[PDB]
Amino acid sequence: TQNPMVTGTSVLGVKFEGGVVIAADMLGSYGSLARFRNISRIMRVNNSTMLGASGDYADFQYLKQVLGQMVIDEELLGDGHSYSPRAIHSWLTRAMYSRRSKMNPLWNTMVIGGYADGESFLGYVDMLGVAYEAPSLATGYGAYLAQPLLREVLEKQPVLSQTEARDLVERCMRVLYYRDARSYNRFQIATVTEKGVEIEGPLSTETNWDIAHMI
Amino acid sequence: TTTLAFKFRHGVIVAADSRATAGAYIASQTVKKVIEINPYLLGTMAGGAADCSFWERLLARQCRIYELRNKERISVAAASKLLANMVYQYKGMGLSMGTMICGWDKRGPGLYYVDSEGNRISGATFSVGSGSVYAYGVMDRGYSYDLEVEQAYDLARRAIYQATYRDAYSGGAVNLYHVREDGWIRVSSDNVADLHEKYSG
Amino acid sequence: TTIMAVQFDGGVVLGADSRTTTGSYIANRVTDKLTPIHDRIFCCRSGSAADTQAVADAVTYQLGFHSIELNEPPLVHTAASLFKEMCYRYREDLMAGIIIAGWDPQEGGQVYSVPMGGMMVRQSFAIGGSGSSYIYGYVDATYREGMTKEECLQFTANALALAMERDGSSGGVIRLAAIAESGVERQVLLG
Amino acid sequence: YDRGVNTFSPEGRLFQVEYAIEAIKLGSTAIGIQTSEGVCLAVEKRITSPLMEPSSIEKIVEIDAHIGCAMSGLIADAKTLIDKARVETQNHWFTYNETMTVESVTQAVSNLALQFGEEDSRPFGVALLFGGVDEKGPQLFHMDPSGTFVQCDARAIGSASEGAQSSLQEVYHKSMTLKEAIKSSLIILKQVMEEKLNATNIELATVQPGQNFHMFTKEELEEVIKDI
Amino acid sequence: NQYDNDVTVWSPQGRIHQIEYAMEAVKQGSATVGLKSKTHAVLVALKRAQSELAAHQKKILHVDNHIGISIAGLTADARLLCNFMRQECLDSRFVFDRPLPVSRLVSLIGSKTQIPTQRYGRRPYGVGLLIAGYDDMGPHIFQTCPSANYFDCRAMSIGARSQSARTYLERHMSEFMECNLNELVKHGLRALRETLPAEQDLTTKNVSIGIVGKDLEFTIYDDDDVSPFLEGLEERPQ
Amino acid sequence: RFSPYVFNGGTILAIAGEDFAIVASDTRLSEGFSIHTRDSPKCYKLTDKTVIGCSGFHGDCLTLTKIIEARLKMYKHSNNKAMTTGAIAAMLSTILYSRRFFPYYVYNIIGGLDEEGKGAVYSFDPVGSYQRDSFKAGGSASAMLQPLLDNQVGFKNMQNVEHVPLSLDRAMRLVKDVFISAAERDVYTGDALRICIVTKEGIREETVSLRKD
Amino acid sequence: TGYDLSASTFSPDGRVFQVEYAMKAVENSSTAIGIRCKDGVVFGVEKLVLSKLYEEGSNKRLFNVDRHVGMAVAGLLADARSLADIAREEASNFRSNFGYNIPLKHLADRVAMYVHAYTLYSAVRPFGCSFMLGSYSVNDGAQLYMIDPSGVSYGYWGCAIGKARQAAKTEIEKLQMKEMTCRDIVKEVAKIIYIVHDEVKDKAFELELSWVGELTNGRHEIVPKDIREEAEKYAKESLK
């Protein structure tokens, strides 16, 4: 991929006590035109791991196709083994690194959240094969905008409950609505626990415009 | 970078500096730029660090197999020719290599020059490097075929000193090897700051 | 070039202009921009002319061979899947603006969008082409859920006529098609 | 049944590789002994003509400057295995700056001792003895056309194989020395060859830890004969 | 006997004889015994001397940090399947960054040995693999066969005269799930001594023991560390 | 259009002792004008006597580390022993040259013990030329660290100063002081300092905090 | 005879004995039956314990091809494993090229043509396997298929593969399967396995029951017969 046609935008993610919560919006902008304003950008992998992505969307449907097959292919064995969320983060790294070495990359930036064996997991994957783990992640402009709000709380308080974490994302999703030209006031929140993967519906934000009456 | 090599009545003299830079930044001062191929062959490192290091090691891999099959050491003209053909296949792809091949042969002393462009030539005196042209003046004024052994040691040690003085990309120590009929022998390795007090008086 | 597709309760409604241009000269004054694939599935094409003609003949070859094996009418989602495979694979080589619509026995009317990238999405209504940006704010202020067939024929006719009036690469004559369970009703309109 | 390597017997077996072991049996004899001071090695030449130049008949070749070799059976199969074994140690030095150990030499050699029908030809007709001094001291090994690689303390192959091995187990013990084991070897040789033993029927090869050079004896061999 | 030439030719009774003959090549090798507890899977093999002073040929060989295999049959197909075995293990380390499940590794071997049992131009692999391992669900003992029918088992013994070891294991398989590391090993090497003629004894120089544990990497012992295992035994009941 | 490289920062230091080796690095992972994480050490324990550091483009650092750990196992099942420190340095030069016309953008330093129990440091370049040194500093802050270690370790440009060899305890405070001075003037350096010490008794690790700006 | 070495040659009356020989190698395998109700397909395999060291669920003959398709193989077990991997791989390409689940009528056609290709050339032999294919859908109902070693594939309501192929479908056909629910079928499969040859010439066996239909919501999985154990509680009542 040399020219991303239909692109998404920033994706957030943060650990908490016993799970990982991830949010992203529902917009398929084409340049500046917000052409596809009802799409899903979060894929529920089997029961513990969970994927959201940014960048080109046609490339995202390709990885949605390939990862969908690999999960089915292990469940048909029935040997009691599944892919850990760290294993998906390992496989996806080698897929991206091999793809840029042919100089024909996949224009994406992906966030992998997972909860297995009582342990949360939150991983980053770049287009160029740069991958790491962190207690809080943000892609796009959210690495410039929402990322300082995430790190200030986690340094002042290292662990978070579920209601604290979910409330904190809605604040950061509000701020991205004010100052990102590719944002949209309709997003969805996905959350892994030990109970499984759950995806909330098309939520919305609440804006303030009292400074408009000022000069 | 400055190397030189010349042959005379009593074998071949090889000398080089030890400074390797990266742009305007000096990486090290202790770079061995004379690659010891065999107990009977010596090669230099002039232009490109890993390029001269790889292909001469691949040549040393090749000459040993020739010795095991034919029960005889390879000639100096042969080892120069094998290195010239390996580099020529990658012509234009951006290799830097300007080394020299030294060694005693059944025909006597041997001195060949090898480029990354494919300039396999023989000769009597050579000097390769960024400060190479500073060495051709002081060496050719003092060169004779009938020099003594200790006189030829002082000539090559002086010539590297005058090259590292004017050039900015040359410094460190001054290595010095001597190729004899039986095999090469390391002579000495002197720092320039020690040679500065000796030569100034 | 402006193409149009609206589904309703019975089936779908398609529509397009003609005016195949080349630079600033109209090469073809009247043009079938909409193309049959199977008896119930059409597509309307945009972008390069020689590319989209070559793709639509390959999909008709593959889908037409595929239904004779199954001895079943094909799915509209199956036809939209085949355009996605050729466009995503041969991206950086093609400029295709395919919209696939048609009636299906399992699912009724459906409308799919395959833009130049290679993605695929189902929509209630879909437009495309060069002159699609002009009626683009008219269409969502005028659209209303739960239309009849005759309203959708009136809806797309007024929708295409605004871009055809305005965009220089668009215009000519309006070609419409209504696909339902009964048959295919094609008509040529001006107004 | 046999007539081809792609076929089993009802009992095992081959029936093709078994015939390859039989081709060793008409080779010349060869004895090597592993001893803590170093590995000695001996062979019989079997020269036919006086016009026949003797040093063109090779039985000890030098694989590397610390590993010797000894062969029997078909010479035509042997020259291929000697050619690769020199290259395999040479590539290992090229990419590791070290000497390949004596055990791991034969691993590379046995990897195409067993390739004869395993592609996608016949098995070889040659048995080998490898002696060398690696970092675990002196070593002695033995292989076969079936690729069965093994370590031996004192081995004798070729013709007169069983006649040597029975006599060779009598005199061997763990606390031998190198000069003892050389004259212990050629006593067995003159018992099992047919000619009067002289300086032209046999040749030697010894490798020592501090003496990586000179896997050979050159007419000092005449002095060892009169020390019988 | 005219049907007894190729792998391709079926018999008029439905039994391909070339696969039936490769079963007989497994009985040429020596005996070896594998078993497991809830926490520890131990396979014990028997070396065989070539001559009086040559070294004994090894049987147990390391594959990965959680898998080691035993061997019986041709040494040609031994290292040929081993090099395929080691290659697949480090690919899952390279790609997925996890160790392989032991069960789905063996299914790759059955797919590997299937093709030379059907196409012409290649013999079957005469080999007798016993596999010990640790996936996430504990220890495993697997065996294979040249007919590519891999079996999950809790104790097994294959090789020459290995039936006498199997009869020992059937009357003690209830005892195996509860014992610790120590007597589980010497439950196992009480089984090898019935695969021996009654005049010689299981010494140090002719036996190997490999243990992989739940917290223990696969470790091969030979000739010196066997003496802590050979202590605490009775003589043969003669 | 698509460019296949990016710079991530980092600083690697190694010192060959008389019977030890010390490899240290920061844990900051950055890109452009952003901080990805503050916890990403560049040390990698290859064997019990060899630690490698990898700087530069981070996607090649993850790939090259996994290639080396595969070939350590390929050596061991083929040769029944672990690689030495000098054997790994000879192997790595062939790996780096193998992609001569599409190079790894990685600076490498291998520190560890030799077969005699002494320290050994091998520096590298992105194409695969190497040499054995006593101390090297690689990465972004490499120019800020080489002139100071020439003064203290090499005793260059000093008059009438005896040459006592570097003890272990004196070498620790030299490493802790050079990164404090480097974190003041370099922007790609901070947030921690992971130090690995290779002796004849195993590998010790130690973490010292730095400034967080 | 004397015309029956290759599978590429005809007999003087016009058939191929290498296909004929491989069919009656399946005949020596143990009996595995299949039956479909009005809203699903129920499988059943008589599987016998080798000696004692079998570990209770090893080397099963109930495979799992797709999300909603599985096999009931009988014959050479290793030959069926490689043949099952063809069917696993075939459904993935249909998913990738068409975006929906494979129809069972089309899946049996793709496999049987692949089985057919081993019946032509002299370089390869025919397969020594035969198997079942069951699935369920809301747009298609339940289907049940049957593939011989020659490649002939078409649909049944009930079938049996093994020694007692005739002796099992003698009493399959006395069931009113068109109106029974598949939960009633599970206890009825249990007696048909248990009627034929429990331990007469053999020692012991173990029952395996696979299960697909509307109650599993289109999934294919093993029965919970560790739950309620109702097969053996009801099949062993036929002692009188």
Question: Using an 8 Å Cβ cutoff, are G132 and G32 in contact?
Answer: yes
The residue whose two tokens read 């009292």 is: A210
| Nearest to G172, CA basis, from G154, G155, G193 | G193
Instruction: Give D103-167 as a 3 state SS string.
Output: HHHHHHHHHHHCCCCCCCCCCCCEEEEEEEEECCEEEEEECCCCCCCEECCEEEECCCHHHHHHH
Instruction: Indicate which of G21, G54, G121 best probes the interface with E, i.e. most E CBs within 10 Å of its own CB.
Output: G21
**Based on the number of CB atoms within 10 Å of its own CB, is F161 exposed (0-12), middle (13-18) or buried (19 or more)?**
exposed
User: What DSSP letter does each residue of C12-79 carry, written as one string?
Assistant: EEEEE---EEETTEEEESS---EEESSSSEEEE--B-HHHHHHHHHHHHHHHHHHHHHHTSPPPHHHH
Q: What is the resolution of this structure in A?
A: 3.3
Please tell me which residue of chain E has the smallest CA distance to D14: E25
Give the residue from D23, D26, D38 showing the smallest Cα distance to D204. Answer: D38
Judging contacts by C-beta atoms under 8 Å, the chain C residues touching residue G103 are: 70
The backbone region for E159, taken as left when phi is positive above 0, alpha when psi lies in -120 to 50, beta otherwise, is left
Amino acid at position F176, single letter: K
Chains that touch A (3 or more CB pairs under 8 A): C, E, F, G
| Six token digits for residue E91 | 């690919």
Given A129, A133, A134, which is nearest F59 (Cβ)? A129
First to last CA, chain E: 45
Nearest Cβ partner of A5 from C116, C120, C121?
A: C116
Tell me if A76 and G95 make a contact (CB, 8 A cut-off): no
G52 CB neighbour count, 10 Å cutoff: 15
Q: After which residues is chain D broken (C to N over 2.5 A)?
A: 120
Q: Which residues pair with A123 in a beta bridge?
A: A112, A133
Q: In B, which residues are within 8 Å of F101 by CB distance? A: 93-94
| Separation CA B146–CA B161 (nearest Å) | 23
Return the SS3 of G9.
coil
The alpha-carbon gap from B169 to the nearest alpha carbon of chain F, in Å, equals 17
Distance CA C114, CA C134 (A): 20
Report residue B6 as tokens. 């010349």
Nearest Cα neighbor of D204 from D192, D82, D184, D191 is D184
Please state, in angstroms and rounded to a whole number, the distance separating the CA atoms of residues A52 and A39. Answer: 12
- Alpha-carbon distance E56 to nearest alpha carbon in chain G (angstroms): 31
CB of G55 within 8 Å of a chain E CB? The answer is yes
The verdict on a CB contact (< 8 Å) between C77 and G106 is no
Chains sharing 3 or more CB pairs under 8 A with chain F: A, B, D, E
Give the alpha-carbon dihedral of G147, G153, G159, G160, to 10 degrees: -20
Rounded Cα distance between F195 and E61, Å, is 37
Which chain A residues are within 8 Å of G95, Cβ to Cβ? Answer: 69
Pairwise CB contact (< 8 Å): G96 & A78: no
Does D94 lie at the interface with B, CB-CB under 8 angstroms? yes
CB contact under 8 A, F4 and A103: yes
Task: Kindly write down the DSSP assignment for every residue of chain A, as one continuous string.
Answer: --S--SB---EEEEEETTEEEEEEE--EEETTEEEE-S---EE--SSSEEEEEEEBHHHHHHHHHHHHHHHHHHHTT-SS----HHHHHHHHHHHHHHHHHTT----EEEEEEEEETTEEEEEEE-TTS-EEE-SEEE-TTHHHHTHHHHHHHHHH-S---HHHHHHHHHHHHHHHHHS-TT--S-EEEEEE-SS-EEE---B------GGGS--
- Residue F144 DSSP one-character state: G
Are G106 and C75 an interchain contact pair (Cβ–Cβ within 8 Å)? no
Closest residue in A to F66 (Cα) is: A94
Q: Do G99 and C69 touch (CB under 8 A)?
A: no
Q: Which residues of G touch C66 (CB under 8 A)?
A: 98
Tokens standing for residue G134: 């069951």
**Partner residue opposite E8 with nearest CB, options G54, G58, G124:** G124
CA distance C6 to C124: 7
For residue F52, give the 3-state DSSP assignment.
Answer: strand
Helices F58-79, D102-113: crossing angle, 10 deg rounding: 90
- Is B49 annotated as belonging to a binding site? yes
Of B30, B53, B93, the CB nearest to F129: B53
Residue E57 in contact with residue E187, Cβ under 8 Å? Answer: no
CA torsion angle A98 A103 A107 A110 (round to 10): 20
> Cβ of A4 and C117 within 8 Å?
yes
**Residue pair A30/C128 in contact by the 8 Å Cβ criterion:** no
∠ at Cα A97 (A91, A101), nearest 5°?
145
Answer left, alpha or beta for residue D147, where phi above 0 means left and psi between -120 and 50 means alpha. Answer: left
Q: Does G99 touch chain C (CB under 8 A)?
A: yes
Closest-CA distance, A175 to chain E, in angstroms, reads 37
Please give the angle made by the CA atoms of E88, E94 and E97, to the nearest 5 degrees: 105
**Nearest Cβ partner for A76 among G64, G95, G96:** G64
Distance between F57 CA and the closest CA of chain E, angstroms: 20
| B164 is known as an active-site residue | no
Method: cryo-EM
Task: Give the span between the Cα atoms of A173 and A152, in whole angstroms.
Answer: 16
F97, with CB counted inside 10 A (0-12, 13-18, 19+), is middle
Q: Which of A79, A92, A98 to mutate to test the interface with E (most CBs of E within 10 A)?
A: A79
Query: A78 to chain G: which residues are within 8 Å by CB?
Result: 64
Pick from E121, E123, D8, E17: nearest CA to G25: E17
Give every CB contact of residue C178 below 8 A, 6+ residues apart in sequence. C11, C12, C13, C14, C149, C153, C184, C185, C186
Cβ within 8 Å, pair A57-C115: no
Residue E104's nearest CA partner among G83, G63, A71, A79 is A79
CA contacts within 13 A on the Cβ side of B32: 15
Q: How far apart are CA F29 and CA F8, in angstroms?
A: 6
CB contact under 8 A, E151 and G54: yes
Retrieve residue A132's tokens.
């790491």
Question: CA-to-CA distance for B117 and G95, rounded, in angstroms?
Answer: 55
Among candidates G159, G146, G157, G142, which has minimal Cα distance to G213? G142
Short-list E110, E191, E98, E178, CA closest to E146: E110
Type and span of the H or E element at E121: none
Contact E75 D9 (CB under 8 A): no
3-state secondary structure of C80: helix
Tell me if D169 and E21 make a contact (CB, 8 A cut-off): no
Comparing CB atoms, the residue among D11, D146, D172 nearest residue E24 is: D11
CA C34 to chain centre: 6
What are the structural domains of chain G? 1-240 (3.60.20.10)
Dmax (CA) for chain C in angstroms is 47
Q: Residue C188 in contact with residue C173, Cβ under 8 Å?
A: yes
Q: What is chain B's alpha carbon radius of gyration, rounded to the nearest angstrom?
A: 16
Instruction: Tell whether B193 lies on the interface with F, counting CB pairs under 8 A.
Output: no
Q: Three-state DSSP class for G160?
A: strand
Amino acid identity of residue B201, one-letter, is G
Distance from F201 to chain B by nearest Cα, in Å? 31
Distance CA B153, CA B4 (A): 12
Read off the DSSP letter of residue F196.
Answer: E
Rounded to 5°, angle at Cα A210 from A206 and A211: 120
Residue for token digits 């189902």? C122
Whose tokens are 């390869």? That residue is: G124
Contact C120 A61 (CB under 8 A): yes
CA distance B61 to chain D (A): 6
Longest dimension (CA), chain G: 58
Give whole-number Cα distances, F154 to F145, F165, F179, in Å.
13, 10, 18
Q: Pick from F76, F80, F85, F98 the residue to mutate for testing the D interface (most D CBs within 10 Å).
A: F80
**Contact in structure between B24 and B81 (CB atoms under 8 Å):** no
- Give the 3-state secondary structure of G94-115: HHHHHCCCCCHHHHHHHHHHHH
**Separation in Å, CA F79 to CA E148, F45, F71:** 31, 21, 12
Measured in whole angstroms, how far is the alpha carbon of residue F43 from the centre of its chain?
Answer: 7
G44, G208 contact by CB (below 8 A): yes
Query: Taking a C-beta distance cutoff of 8 angstroms, is the pair A8, A168 a contact?
Result: no
Tell me how far apart the alpha carbons of residues C75 and C179 are, in angstroms, rounded to a whole number. 14
Give the mutation candidate from E94, E95, E152 for the A interface (greatest A CB count, under 10 A).
E95
- Min distance G136 CA to chain C CA atoms (Å): 17
